[PDB]
Ligand binder design. Sequence first.
Ligand SMILES: */C1=C\C(=O)C/C(C)=C\C=C\C(=O)O[C@H]([C@H](O)NC(=O)/C=C\C=C\C)C/C(C)=C/[C@@H]2COC[C@H](C1)O2
Ligand SMILES: Nc1nc2c(ncn2[C@@H]2O[C@H](COP(=O)(O)OP(=O)(O)OP(=O)(O)O)[C@@H](O)[C@H]2O)c(=O)[nH]1
Ligand SMILES: Nc1nc2c(ncn2[C@@H]2O[C@H](COP(=O)(O)OP(=O)(O)OP(=O)(O)O)[C@@H](O)[C@H]2O)c(=O)[nH]1
Ligand SMILES: [Ca+2]
Ligand SMILES: [Mg+2]
Ligand SMILES: [Mg+2]
Lengths: 439, 429, 57
Amino acid sequence: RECISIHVGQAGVQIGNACWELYCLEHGIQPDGQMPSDKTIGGGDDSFNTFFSETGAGKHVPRAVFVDLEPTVIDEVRTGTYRQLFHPEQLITGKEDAANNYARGHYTIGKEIIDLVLDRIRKLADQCTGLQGFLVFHSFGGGTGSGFTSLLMERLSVDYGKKSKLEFSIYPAPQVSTAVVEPYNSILTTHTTLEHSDCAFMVDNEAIYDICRRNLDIERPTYTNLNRLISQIVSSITASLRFDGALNVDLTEFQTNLVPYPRIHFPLATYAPVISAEKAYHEQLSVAEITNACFEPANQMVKCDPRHGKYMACCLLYRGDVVPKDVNAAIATIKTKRSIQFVDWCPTGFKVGINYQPPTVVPGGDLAKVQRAVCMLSNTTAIAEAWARLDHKFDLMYAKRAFVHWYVGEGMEEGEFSEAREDMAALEKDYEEVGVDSV
Amino acid sequence: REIVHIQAGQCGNQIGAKFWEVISDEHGIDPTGSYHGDSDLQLERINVYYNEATGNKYVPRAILVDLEPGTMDSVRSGPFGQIFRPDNFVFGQSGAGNNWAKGHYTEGAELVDSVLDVVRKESESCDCLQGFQLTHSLGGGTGSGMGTLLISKIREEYPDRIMNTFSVMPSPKVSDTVVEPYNATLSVHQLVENTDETYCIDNEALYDICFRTLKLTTPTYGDLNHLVSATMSGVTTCLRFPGQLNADLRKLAVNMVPFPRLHFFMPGFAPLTSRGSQQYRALTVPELTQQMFDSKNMMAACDPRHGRYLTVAAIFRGRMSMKEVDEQMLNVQNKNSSYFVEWIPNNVKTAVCDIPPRGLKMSATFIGNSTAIQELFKRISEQFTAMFRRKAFLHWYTGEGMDEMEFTEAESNMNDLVSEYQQYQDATA
Amino acid sequence: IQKAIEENNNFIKMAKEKLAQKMESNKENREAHLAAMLERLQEKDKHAEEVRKNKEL
Ligand SMILES: */C1=C\C(=O)C/C(C)=C\C=C\C(=O)O[C@H]([C@H](O)NC(=O)/C=C\C=C\C)C/C(C)=C/[C@@H]2COC[C@H](C1)O2
Ligand SMILES: Nc1nc2c(ncn2[C@@H]2O[C@H](COP(=O)(O)OP(=O)(O)OP(=O)(O)O)[C@@H](O)[C@H]2O)c(=O)[nH]1
Ligand SMILES: Nc1nc2c(ncn2[C@@H]2O[C@H](COP(=O)(O)OP(=O)(O)OP(=O)(O)O)[C@@H](O)[C@H]2O)c(=O)[nH]1
Ligand SMILES: [Ca+2]
Ligand SMILES: [Mg+2]
Ligand SMILES: [Mg+2]
């Protein structure tokens, strides 16, 4: 059941680098791709084969494509530590980027490389015996992350039909953004990909930044600090596909519960524990402690307030030294003490998975290595707050047509803006409607 | 991602030579074109401004243009004069006599084809040309008239590349040449239509900084150009060193230009303190931040507190705490909230580059798209009208074949630019 | 099962078509922006002729 990862634009690529490095450490895969513990040479059907193919020389190769419209970020993959893990052909670059302009990524520059990117992904698909789907990593804010991704996801719906496509999408924050026009790009790509994506995990750079500052005591987080935390969350989510175990619950099964209507497909991720080595020392954080932490808004991947919306699902993905008994006792404590209101048309039980493989950390990182961690995925109406903030930024600029000439100059029309924005207003309203009580 | 640099006329060549001197020192390139520096930061994006030759030599991607030979003879004898490619010097013999019509329609037109020949030889060996930067004055004939001619011809051959200028605006404090307003108004008429981004380097502001702040009682062109080259160094740091923000001409334009005609920037530099006041006032991030938002640090003579910012780029250089930079930038925005239009959120972007300018531990450079730039245009407009209503000196232009109407149109275009700035200043969310 | 096939094929189709229409509209729009620019620039070369001509008289 193979999964193909596609990493688009700077944010997508740099998060991909952190994720594949962590996956290699979790699985005992060395930077040359060798894995001594794997006794089947040149293939097999182990759980880790969802994410890695094998060559007859014993190399374990990510089922991944990295694509960027300029070369300098991918060139660091090509010459860095994990350069031997990837075939040259899985790393694809143009020469000129999209200049923070959705229109350039989707049309002017994007259209020149799309065929080649689809040709490379096909060579990955052809080696799969039961491809399950794609995982697509990208910024909302960049021109490539926004417009090349939209283009790619439309093209993948044509070439693979209803094969599942999941996103990890980086929602912009002012402390690390690089373009004033990010709100435009965010709304344009959200509108364009919405019907082509089955499930999308938004990561608010500002929630990550704040967790880094507050819980890891980093004064001024860099992308490297953000990406290490992001990869832990991503790893939590994909661990169900890459490891086995009787209590491991596949991601697709969680998704059954997370997606009640096709458009309502944006779970809120919350991860614990995020703690420094200095604080973790002489300090065991119990199942109850980490579970409690998943209902603290400050640990969420997107800034919003779930206490002021309604739940439609709650899933707990545990990793490490966790047994159901302790999970059940922690959930029961939380039910008596927290602000957890479900919509009236949904069951209120929490769905639990447990993967026994302990969490891992990358050397020279900020996170303490811990014995047990948890990622909560909830579907709450509060996530629409994040669309409301972006929508308002779009409105302030669009009312004056600020910067719109850059897009129109690349062949876009004003109608595309108003169509995108209207779709977002309809999505905000969808979120309101699902949380009203049944008559 | 190469930039091709063109310098035209005396002013353009004089400040262009200084630009090449300063950035060559920053990248560890000597007058022979050899690299003799310490840090890998210096070579990482060297190709943006320099071609590599045989012998591990670095040659500026630079074209030197004038209708008279004098300043280019000076350039060749200047420091760094042997670094330019000989074939990249294109000069006539005539001179343009401070006459825009001669640069734009007559003598300049006769030479422009041979300039374009060299532009194309430079462009054609670029891996992926980003665009062009031009240095010139607006107040004389060749930089003004021939420079704006070059822009339009380049834009015809490279319509999807970015065109950037460093444009020196005239002031009666520096030159008494009476026709400077005519040539500047005619030139601005062109810039509005044909550049994507123009740094307004105002001789009035350079004079006032030298005289009032640095206490030079008789500023020379040398003193003015020392400031210009420091500013030019600052506003190109993002193109020349690794970094995240405004790393290329087009990304800079997309962040700074909300409406195509409003592409005229007020540059600024900090610190600007006299040696005498330096004994008292420490050089710190809060000091740079306060100074870079002050009207006295601006290289266009406009008070930003007389208008509003559409967009700002703030670049810090040197070793300093990122946390402190972030805090000061937030603070200065909060304290000046009214002066940032509400309908462009998060319109101030900040970068920090590790390498400081020569002789400083830290500096800051500011690039503001402010509606108060209208003050520079109004100043030129008033000097233009005082002449044009008496038809003073028109015969110099009509004798090159121009008519009055072209003047009326250039004035009108510039007054409409002013009105458009006012409109966005007055607009509310 | 025929309904399921038919809706999958119809979703592919409509996506292939919308995307060909978007890409064509885009292409034409951009080319027209370029052609307008070029035509403004050629009007200038023409005016420059007329100036040098007016000088000759
Ligand atoms: C040009 C050097 C040159 O020819 C003259 C010399 C030797 C020095 C000039 C220094 C100068 O102009 O310094 C300016 C400020 O006066 N300095 C300060 O305000 C310093 C500290 C203030 C604390 C509160 C700054 C400038 C314009 C420096 C530029 C930078 O680019 C290199 C250029 C060298 O000097
Ligand atoms: N978390 C995180 N965010 C990033 C990273 N790199 C960029 N971003 C964010 O992504 C947005 C900018 O888009 P990028 O991905 O840099 O742009 P791109 O996709 O390469 O698009 P173009 O450069 O415009 O071609 C901003 O919101 C940045 O903060 C990264 O490694 N991690
Ligand atoms: N800051 C600065 N301004 C200068 C310099 N040289 C000339 N100027 C200004 O430039 C304008 C005069 O235009 P020049 O650049 O001398 O003229 P040109 O482009 O050579 O055109 P012609 O001499 O008519 O053939 C005036 O406003 C001068 O003050 C210089 O080195 N620095
Ligand atoms: Ca195997
Ligand atoms: Mg990029
Ligand atoms: Mg002169």
